């Protein structure tokens, strides 16, 4: 009946009110044409001011969408770039997550993974921990879908459920213990790029230092930082944060691992981002098959963020060359953390 579930797992105890719980749900594909009207409509806050139903201007990059009979030849494919307004995608404003801890309002938004004709939205809710004591369930409409959100009492008292076990990651590295009593586990993390200019937000200076990649003109590159939640329940992590062990494992994860096969690679493609650029500013790879990985990224070589939506293409997310690259808007992965299992 086009009804899907989203679970908010409220822990029994957390240390700080500045702590977000993450819910998400991957939804079935919709026609690409329908994305232009998609916007989450949530009953989850008492005041129905849904701050992220703001417009972000994207450059939508597309290719023919159909491969010829010459798979072996790797002629590139011409792209079309169009300016489009998308509402409700996970473009977090600077300080929005922090402000939620005081307003107690949750943030609702979606990622898109698309081939040339269909898009799978992944709906996220970022819930400030104090709202677990105010809410039991609510409803989000997105396109044809109705998502019933449920605030559940978690299985774990305080940690992260990892294979039926409750792992509690250490919060800090105040004391280094040479022969410790502890475990290491691989914990899921989600990171969102927050676009904001300033002299501390020159993330590509840190990309240059950490990965000895080839980036001249690091002064012309996108400015901002990633904000991440670990284990679906944590205080936010700001990435990069030098002299912070977990920020730096996520930083490595974002820039080294942004990702029978369900898709097939068709050929290279280059695009103008934004539509009016005098030459191509982004490299991509056209693919065919099931929508695979996020279609949302941010252009590397513009200090003011140029958001890119590239249905049916993989943007170049590899920063060896830096020119004509992009970064992920939403990155998901695993990082290893020390901690211990509850018992
Ligand atoms: C980013 O692209 C570079 C360039 O192809 C990749 O670096 C190559 O990696 C292979 C092994 O995977 C080496 O044999 C080459 O010598 C490398 N080329 C260089 C350093 O110029 C790199 O693997 C890509 N990054 C990711 C994460 O896949
Ligand atoms: C683009 O992606 C869509 C969505 O995955 C593909 O359409 C689905 O194809 C699967 C498997 O072939 C079918 O089981 C579904 O019925 C299709 N979904 C819909 C909504 O029709 C489609 O094949 C992809 N297009 C190309 C050219 O690969």
XYZ file of C-alpha atoms and ligand atoms in Angstrom:
399
model
C 0.000 0.000 0.000
C 3.109 2.180 -0.561
C 3.594 2.311 3.257
C 7.162 1.930 4.550
C 8.629 2.042 8.050
C 11.272 4.271 9.566
C 12.597 3.434 13.046
C 14.096 5.994 15.409
C 15.990 3.893 18.022
C 15.953 5.936 21.249
C 18.660 4.715 23.656
C 17.870 4.251 27.280
C 20.730 6.626 28.334
C 23.049 9.109 26.582
C 25.586 11.486 28.080
C 24.695 14.800 26.329
C 21.625 16.600 24.990
C 23.813 17.486 21.993
C 23.306 14.040 20.477
C 21.361 13.097 17.313
C 19.662 9.813 16.495
C 19.542 8.936 12.776
C 16.674 7.112 11.070
C 16.577 6.272 7.393
C 14.730 4.220 4.855
C 15.538 3.393 1.244
C 12.389 3.672 -0.918
C 11.503 2.061 -4.302
C 12.365 3.905 -7.531
C 10.279 6.720 -9.023
C 10.437 8.266 -12.536
C 13.231 10.826 -12.782
C 10.677 13.433 -13.945
C 8.903 13.101 -10.564
C 11.989 14.228 -8.567
C 11.332 17.883 -9.436
C 8.236 17.885 -7.236
C 9.477 15.642 -4.419
C 9.662 17.172 -0.967
C 9.242 15.484 2.444
C 5.991 16.408 4.157
C 6.348 15.498 7.824
C 3.994 15.584 10.769
C 6.947 14.987 13.099
C 7.392 18.496 14.575
C 4.605 20.236 16.518
C 5.327 23.437 14.635
C 5.074 22.491 10.953
C 7.890 24.757 9.728
C 10.034 22.241 7.786
C 13.245 24.207 7.394
C 14.837 22.002 4.738
C 11.935 22.328 2.288
C 14.092 25.231 1.129
C 15.197 25.182 -2.558
C 18.759 24.306 -3.455
C 19.811 25.120 -7.018
C 21.454 22.110 -8.633
C 23.123 21.528 -11.989
C 21.391 18.474 -13.361
C 23.781 16.573 -15.646
C 22.418 13.868 -17.968
C 23.556 11.779 -20.957
C 21.675 10.051 -23.806
C 20.791 7.245 -21.420
C 21.044 4.411 -23.999
C 24.221 2.589 -25.088
C 24.790 1.847 -28.757
C 26.147 -1.398 -30.143
C 29.780 -0.308 -29.771
C 30.507 -1.233 -26.138
C 34.237 -1.808 -26.850
C 34.915 1.736 -28.122
C 35.147 4.231 -25.297
C 34.097 7.404 -27.155
C 32.877 9.802 -24.521
C 29.193 10.729 -24.310
C 27.850 14.254 -24.664
C 26.060 15.616 -21.581
C 23.363 18.205 -21.051
C 23.571 20.555 -18.017
C 20.372 22.221 -16.744
C 19.724 24.388 -13.670
C 17.036 22.811 -11.501
C 15.523 23.594 -8.102
C 15.379 20.621 -5.764
C 13.624 20.879 -2.386
C 14.289 18.673 0.613
C 17.575 17.025 -0.393
C 20.121 16.611 2.416
C 21.860 19.945 2.078
C 22.458 20.846 5.729
C 22.886 24.529 6.587
C 25.733 25.521 8.893
C 24.527 25.250 12.550
C 21.175 23.602 11.680
C 22.035 20.358 13.532
C 23.385 22.258 16.510
C 20.268 24.431 16.698
C 18.046 21.290 16.696
C 19.433 20.289 20.098
C 17.689 23.419 21.590
C 14.566 23.704 19.361
C 14.073 19.925 19.674
C 13.028 19.865 16.021
C 14.082 17.020 13.818
C 15.542 17.510 10.325
C 14.092 15.468 7.443
C 15.676 15.213 3.965
C 16.498 12.730 1.181
C 19.405 11.419 -0.921
C 18.854 10.312 -4.543
C 20.453 7.393 -6.376
C 19.406 7.442 -10.045
C 20.036 5.912 -13.411
C 18.964 7.892 -16.495
C 15.263 7.216 -16.028
C 14.535 6.201 -12.341
C 15.557 7.488 -8.876
C 15.652 5.637 -5.517
C 15.239 8.165 -2.702
C 16.755 7.448 0.723
C 14.854 9.434 3.380
C 16.847 10.506 6.507
C 15.621 11.887 9.811
C 18.153 13.492 12.130
C 16.498 13.555 15.556
C 17.838 15.497 18.583
C 17.905 13.155 21.554
C 15.513 15.234 23.707
C 12.736 14.599 21.179
C 12.750 10.899 22.142
C 10.863 12.004 25.271
C 8.172 13.886 23.304
C 7.245 11.686 20.340
C 5.907 8.219 19.721
C 5.159 8.122 16.012
C 4.525 10.373 13.027
C 4.125 10.340 9.266
C 6.296 11.517 6.297
C 4.926 11.726 2.736
C 7.502 11.681 -0.078
C 6.246 11.367 -3.661
C 3.874 8.392 -3.751
C 5.155 7.061 -0.410
C 3.901 7.227 3.163
C 6.574 6.498 5.760
C 5.352 5.682 9.255
C 8.048 6.865 11.683
C 8.174 5.072 15.044
C 10.214 6.168 18.087
C 11.228 2.849 19.643
C 12.992 2.002 22.861
C 16.329 0.616 21.706
C 17.522 -2.907 22.354
C 20.811 -1.598 23.760
C 20.951 0.419 26.934
C 23.462 2.865 25.528
C 25.563 1.370 22.714
C 25.110 0.455 19.049
C 23.595 -2.778 17.984
C 26.219 -4.700 15.994
C 25.142 -8.239 15.063
C 22.846 -8.780 18.059
C 25.426 -7.336 20.474
C 25.557 -3.890 22.127
C 28.877 -2.114 21.495
C 29.674 1.139 23.369
C 32.352 3.212 21.526
C 34.625 5.298 23.700
C 33.733 8.984 23.500
C 37.269 10.347 23.810
C 40.946 9.521 23.921
C 41.740 11.267 27.215
C 43.893 8.374 28.517
C 45.992 6.075 26.317
C 46.005 2.555 27.841
C 48.921 0.412 26.538
C 47.425 -3.033 27.459
C 43.758 -2.312 27.506
C 40.592 -4.287 28.222
C 38.483 -3.384 25.202
C 37.227 -4.364 21.816
C 37.398 -2.781 18.360
C 34.292 -2.789 16.235
C 33.343 -1.557 12.800
C 30.546 0.996 13.268
C 28.313 2.575 10.621
C 28.670 6.324 10.064
C 26.801 8.880 7.891
C 28.354 12.263 6.916
C 26.744 15.349 5.334
C 28.648 18.128 3.634
C 27.949 21.557 5.137
C 28.891 24.277 2.608
C 30.247 27.415 4.275
C 33.059 29.880 3.434
C 35.730 30.947 5.835
C 39.420 30.584 6.495
C 38.905 27.491 8.716
C 36.709 25.766 6.079
C 39.397 25.253 3.397
C 38.890 21.492 3.472
C 41.000 20.956 0.362
C 44.110 22.292 2.122
C 43.655 19.354 4.494
C 42.898 17.025 1.554
C 46.250 18.088 0.029
C 48.147 17.534 3.313
C 46.602 14.194 4.297
C 46.610 12.358 0.978
C 49.606 13.883 -0.916
C 47.336 14.277 -3.916
C 47.926 16.773 -6.736
C 45.966 19.898 -5.949
C 47.326 23.180 -7.100
C 45.131 26.267 -6.569
C 43.713 24.810 -3.374
C 42.538 28.412 -2.807
C 39.837 28.094 -5.495
C 38.224 24.880 -4.018
C 34.856 24.319 -2.268
C 34.794 25.396 1.400
C 32.927 23.666 4.219
C 33.150 20.597 6.432
C 31.400 17.245 6.897
C 29.138 16.720 9.894
C 28.770 13.039 10.854
C 26.712 10.834 13.185
C 28.241 7.525 14.294
C 26.336 4.344 15.010
C 23.027 6.032 14.315
C 23.262 7.798 17.722
C 26.070 10.169 18.767
C 27.285 13.673 19.367
C 28.140 15.182 15.932
C 31.683 14.715 14.562
C 33.152 17.538 12.465
C 35.343 16.346 9.611
C 38.214 17.204 9.247
C 39.185 17.999 12.831
C 42.930 17.785 13.296
C 43.805 16.244 16.649
C 40.551 14.178 16.657
C 41.022 10.483 15.998
C 37.515 9.689 14.812
C 37.191 12.750 12.517
C 40.338 11.595 10.805
C 39.159 8.021 10.225
C 35.977 9.410 8.627
C 38.038 11.892 6.652
C 40.058 8.995 5.214
C 36.855 7.093 4.561
C 35.220 9.994 2.688
C 38.182 10.676 0.444
C 39.471 7.090 -0.120
C 36.228 5.105 -0.289
C 33.356 7.281 -1.529
C 31.849 3.927 -2.777
C 27.617 -10.019 -10.723
C 27.516 -6.233 -11.138
C 24.093 -4.683 -11.290
C 25.324 -1.827 -13.496
C 27.521 -1.583 -16.542
C 29.993 1.174 -17.379
C 29.276 2.820 -20.678
C 31.917 5.496 -21.195
C 33.428 8.718 -19.973
C 31.568 12.044 -20.101
C 32.408 15.647 -19.207
C 29.971 18.370 -18.171
C 29.639 22.104 -17.670
C 28.987 22.919 -14.008
C 27.190 25.261 -13.732
C 25.287 25.230 -17.019
C 26.895 28.518 -18.103
C 30.588 27.571 -17.590
C 32.706 28.317 -20.668
C 34.259 24.846 -20.682
C 33.738 21.507 -18.942
C 34.379 21.608 -15.207
C 33.369 18.081 -14.192
C 34.376 14.577 -15.325
C 31.935 11.676 -14.927
C 31.385 8.083 -16.048
C 28.108 7.157 -17.762
C 26.587 3.886 -16.597
C 23.536 1.800 -17.369
C 21.563 -0.534 -15.147
C 20.029 -0.361 -11.636
C 20.525 3.034 -9.861
C 23.854 2.692 -8.063
C 25.308 5.043 -5.410
C 24.234 8.641 -4.738
C 23.619 10.947 -7.706
C 24.238 14.060 -5.551
C 27.665 15.686 -5.252
C 29.389 19.079 -4.943
C 31.806 20.556 -7.475
C 35.368 20.667 -6.174
C 36.680 23.734 -8.043
C 34.229 26.467 -6.887
C 34.640 27.928 -3.379
C 30.892 28.640 -3.304
C 29.335 25.181 -3.416
C 27.882 24.142 -6.797
C 25.583 21.195 -6.114
C 25.424 18.556 -8.856
C 22.701 16.007 -9.593
C 23.922 13.479 -12.192
C 21.303 10.761 -12.911
C 22.916 7.869 -14.760
C 26.490 9.138 -14.184
C 29.174 8.604 -11.536
C 30.885 11.941 -10.809
C 34.688 11.725 -10.500
C 35.148 11.457 -6.705
C 38.863 10.680 -6.887
C 41.157 13.580 -6.008
C 44.463 12.363 -7.418
C 44.118 14.992 -10.151
C 41.664 17.375 -8.369
C 40.679 19.110 -11.597
C 37.170 18.284 -12.797
C 36.357 16.388 -9.566
C 33.503 16.536 -7.016
C 32.871 15.454 -3.431
C 29.952 13.486 -2.005
C 27.031 15.406 -0.526
C 26.104 12.432 1.709
C 28.699 9.786 2.480
C 28.028 6.511 4.314
C 30.595 4.019 5.527
C 32.124 2.168 8.491
C 34.932 3.187 10.793
C 36.685 1.140 13.473
C 36.248 2.382 17.021
C 37.523 1.172 20.385
C 34.992 0.497 23.059
C 33.458 -2.422 24.903
C 30.359 -4.648 24.703
C 27.612 -4.087 27.309
C 26.792 -7.061 29.536
C 42.312 7.402 -7.973
O 42.906 7.356 -9.267
C 44.280 6.947 -9.247
C 44.804 7.056 -10.674
O 44.496 5.941 -11.504
C 44.427 5.555 -8.628
O 45.803 5.405 -8.309
C 46.356 4.246 -8.940
O 46.153 3.087 -8.138
C 46.650 1.885 -8.743
C 46.201 0.744 -7.857
O 44.814 0.835 -7.552
C 48.168 1.985 -8.909
O 48.664 0.804 -9.539
C 48.531 3.227 -9.725
O 49.946 3.409 -9.787
C 47.865 4.483 -9.141
N 48.094 5.640 -10.001
C 48.672 6.782 -9.594
C 49.117 6.832 -8.158
O 48.832 7.736 -10.358
C 43.664 5.400 -7.315
O 43.537 4.013 -7.016
C 42.262 6.002 -7.383
N 41.656 6.027 -6.059
C 40.747 5.137 -5.639
C 40.242 5.331 -4.239
O 40.349 4.213 -6.356
C 16.808 2.199 -14.381
O 16.536 1.799 -13.035
C 15.231 1.225 -12.907
C 14.984 1.070 -11.422
O 15.844 0.068 -10.904
C 15.159 -0.088 -13.698
O 13.800 -0.515 -13.722
C 13.600 -1.684 -12.960
O 14.216 -2.802 -13.535
C 14.047 -3.906 -12.641
C 15.077 -4.955 -12.992
O 15.330 -4.948 -14.387
C 12.595 -4.367 -12.726
O 12.409 -5.488 -11.862
C 11.663 -3.215 -12.341
O 10.311 -3.523 -12.687
C 12.080 -1.862 -12.983
N 11.482 -0.756 -12.254
C 10.545 0.046 -12.747
C 10.049 1.106 -11.817
O 10.097 -0.093 -13.874
C 15.573 0.120 -15.153
O 15.883 -1.148 -15.718
C 16.845 0.946 -15.296
N 17.035 1.309 -16.690
C 18.051 0.830 -17.410
C 18.131 1.278 -18.861
O 18.866 0.071 -16.921
